[PDB]
């Protein structure tokens, strides 16, 4: 009623989370550059 196996890279879909966080960081980088182009105003 049970056994175990070892996948191969285990997915692309299982790994997708890392690219999710990658894109999120890229977006925050963009918005922060914009906010810097803003806050030189001070």
């Amino acid at each position: 009623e049970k056994n175990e196996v070892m996948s191969s890279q285990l997915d692309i879909d299982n790994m997708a989370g890392v690219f999710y966080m990658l894109g999120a960081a890229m977006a925050l980088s963009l918005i922060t550059f914009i906010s810097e182009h803003l806050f030189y105003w001070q």
């Binding site: 890279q9 790994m15 690219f19 990658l22 890229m26 980088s29 963009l30 182009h37």
Partner: protein, 286 residues
């Protein structure tokens, strides 16, 4: 004594297909493109409140090298590079995890455990084994109310004399084999390419016989009994049977070897070729 089994056993060679095995052929290129993506994003991110330099920095950390002189001089590029490095950690970490989990799990198939073993529980043609003809073994396999299913499976491949069977299985022609114990026990401890399951199978015992009511029986019967307190047969054992030694030494996970790591070694040749190209191309570009 009783009956046992016999099958070849050896050090496995569980091996990876290639150093690139634990990934698919796609993600390998996904990361390769994404690294340049985030590099040029750095290049167009820091330049406003160093091209090849940022290229080097970006493409290095995936190698844990020491190469790289520049750095981000902005704030946003810093907040990017941090997560970039974290990703660089996760990639190689998952790689190690996967390769390990692979090489610990793949311990090769079990040995033939016994009469009730699944891997031979049914008669099967992808797993062929024989027995001894005209002998006590197919005698005891005659009256097999249940075992008849494998009884026929054997009697369709029966064998005649031991020199057939041992020499054959040594040559990996067959898979398994059966006999009485003492013969195969000795044959195992003599040359150490074969082992037994050690599982007893059906009790019996040799002896001596004469035509009925011959006047000897009592004398020989008391003689033999005399020959098991003084341990004379204990000595006969060491004289002939428990004669040698080959250690058990449960096998290992079969070290990687000179075999397939040359998949990696294929890299230095590509390095040399690319270098002898790039030197002339650099002369030109200079």
């Amino acid at each position: 004594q009783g009956l046992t089994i016999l099958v070849k056993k050896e050090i496995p060679r569980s091996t990876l297909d290639s150093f690139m095995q634990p990934f698919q052929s796609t993600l390998w290129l996904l990361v390769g493109l994404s690294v340049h993506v985030v590099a040029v994003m750095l290049y167009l991110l820091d330049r406003f409140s160093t091209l090849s330099s940022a290229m080097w920095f970006s493409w290095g950390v995936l190698l844990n090298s020491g190469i790289g002189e520049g750095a981000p001089r902005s704030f946003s590029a810093r907040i990017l590079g941090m997560v970039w490095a974290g990703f660089a950690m996760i990639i190689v970490a998952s790689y190690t995890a996967n390769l390990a989990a692979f090489l610990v799990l793949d311990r090769p198939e079990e040995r033939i455990t016994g009469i009730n073993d699944p891997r031979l529980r049914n008669p099967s043609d992808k797993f062929i084994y024989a027995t001894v003809k005209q002998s006590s073994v197919d005698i005891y396999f005659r009256r097999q109310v249940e075992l008849s299913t494998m009884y026929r499976h054997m009697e369709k491949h029966n064998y005649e004399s031991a020199a057939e069977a041992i020499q054959a299985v040594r040559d990996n022609k067959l898979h398994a084999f059966i006999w009485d114990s003492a013969v195969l026990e000795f044959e195992a401890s003599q040359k150490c390419d074969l082992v037994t399951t050690g599982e007893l199978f059906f009790r019996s015992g040799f002896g001596i016989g004469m035509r009925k009511d011959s006047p000897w029986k009592q004398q020989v019967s008391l003689s033999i009994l005399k020959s098991h307190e003084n341990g004379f047969m204990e000595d006969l054992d060491k004289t002939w049977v428990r004669y040698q030694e080959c250690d058990s030494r449960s096998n290992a996970p079969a070290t990687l070897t000179c075999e397939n790591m040359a998949g990696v070694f294929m890299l230095v040749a590509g390095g040399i070729v690319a270098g002898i190209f790039l030197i002339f191309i650099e002369i030109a570009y200079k």
